[PDB]
């Protein structure tokens, strides 16, 4: 409910029509962060394998195809410990920095 509320509340504040590949590449960036975190810690694979496979499938299918909100995006940002507002609102730099801090990675984009 909080993710859907953030999704509704964020649309008027964007100021533009969202670009599909912007969202697709944000999802891909989250996938890369997940992969690096798994590389650092093997146990996290048990918690994130299904979501990893789902994100990989969503990034292999046509990008113009929409993504299932509650089935895919909300759990993905949940495991990434990121609000829907942060996912759809922050730029790539802020999103990458927050992801790296969240998974304690040493990367810097």
């Amino acid at each position: 409910i909080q993710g859907i509320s953030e999704l509704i509340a964020l649309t008027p504040q964007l100021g533009y029509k969202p670009i599909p590949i912007e969202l697709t590449r944000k999802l891909q960036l989250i996938l890369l962060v997940f992969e690096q975190a798994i590389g650092k810690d093997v146990k996290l694979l048990g918690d994130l394998g299904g979501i990893m496979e789902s994100l990989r499938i969503a990034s292999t299918t046509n990008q113009s195809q929409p993504y299932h909100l509650v089935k895919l995006i909300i759990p993905v940002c949940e495991k990434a410990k990121i609000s829907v507002f942060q996912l759809f609102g922050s730029d790539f730099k802020e999103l990458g920095k927050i992801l790296f801090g969240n998974f304690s990675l040493e990367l810097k984009l």
Binding site: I21, R25, Q28, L29, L32, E35, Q36, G39, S59, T60, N62, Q63, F92, E106, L107, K108, L109
Partner: protein
């Protein structure tokens, strides 16, 4: 007289993505290791610099066994048997067939980044045939200046005159790596420290050091300054130049310091000409 030319040359500041490693899962990780103070530093393989020098030699005449196609990316041997007497490449870098197995005059060490490698991953999207798909991958880049060390056994050369093109190639080094050099990173040195002596003992291996990643001044290590001041590294045998000379000349007590009597030039080409005159005098060229 067994003459040797050792030197540590330093490059200009810029982005580097030169010698990527096994690329674990998605990131073309930059070749990194441990260095002074136990902080991770990025490296550049010495074999890449040797290949760049060989390519430079092949460019400007200088009959060379290994010709770089530049189109099919295939090395072709001009002659099957290695002949260091006739070819610059076999004379300088040696060879190993597995004949003669030349030891090779030039010795090199890998280039070590001046500042520690902290972060700086970059976004790189590679294309895909899957209905025009673009999968995002990572690529490490480093903003630093690479210094490396090299030694020339001038007596080991079959033709003593072949040393002269080598210094030019070091000064006019071509692009290192080539395709994987994402950002075109020049390897022409911006500050040189050359010691042309006649004994095997060699300091000044890694004299350049600044640390403090916030800036890019590329100072000189206190250890090298102390070694020069103590009495070792005879100043008449020391050739120093580049932007580092501009910093050195501003230093107090520089005139009184033994560093002054060392052969020092603001311009690098002045170093090259004076040193080449010295070599041609000493080698009877």
């Amino acid at each position: 007289p067994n003459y040797y030319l050792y030197g540590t040359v330093l490059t200009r500041y810029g982005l580097a993505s030169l010698n990527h490693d096994i690329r674990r899962g998605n990131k073309t990780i930059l070749q990194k290791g441990y260095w002074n103070n136990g902080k991770i530093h990025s490296f550049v393989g010495s074999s890449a610099i040797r290949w760049a020098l060989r390519f430079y030699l092949q460019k400007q005449g200088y009959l060379v066994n290994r010709v770089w196609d530049e189109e099919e990316h295939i090395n072709r041997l001009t002659s099957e048997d290695f002949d260091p007497e006739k070819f610059y490449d076999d004379d300088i870098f040696g060879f190993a067939l597995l004949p003669n197995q030349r030891m090779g005059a030039l010795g090199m060490n890998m280039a070590v980044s001046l500042t520690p490698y902290d972060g700086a991953v970059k976004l790189g999207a590679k294309s895909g045939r899957e209905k025009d798909s673009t999968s995002l991958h990572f690529t490490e880049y480093h903003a630093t200046r690479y210094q490396y060390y090299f030694g020339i056994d001038a007596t080991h050369l079959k033709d003593f005159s072949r040393i002269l093109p080598m210094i030019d190639g070091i000064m006019n080094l071509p692009k290192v790596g080539g395709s994987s050099n994402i950002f075109n990173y020049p390897f022409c040195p911006d500050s040189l420290v050359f010691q042309w002596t006649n004994h095997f003992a060699s300091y000044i291996s890694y004299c350049f050091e600044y640390c403090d990643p916030k800036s890019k001044e590329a100072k000189l290590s206190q250890e090298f300054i102390d070694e020069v001041e103590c009495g070792q590294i005879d100043p008449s045998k020391l050739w120093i130049g580049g932007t580092i000379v501009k910093d050195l000349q501003q230093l107090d007590n520089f005139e009184s310091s033994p560093l002054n009597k060392a052969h020092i030039y603001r311009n690098r080409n002045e170093m090259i000409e004076a040193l080449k005159t010295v070599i041609k005098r000493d080698l009877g060229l």
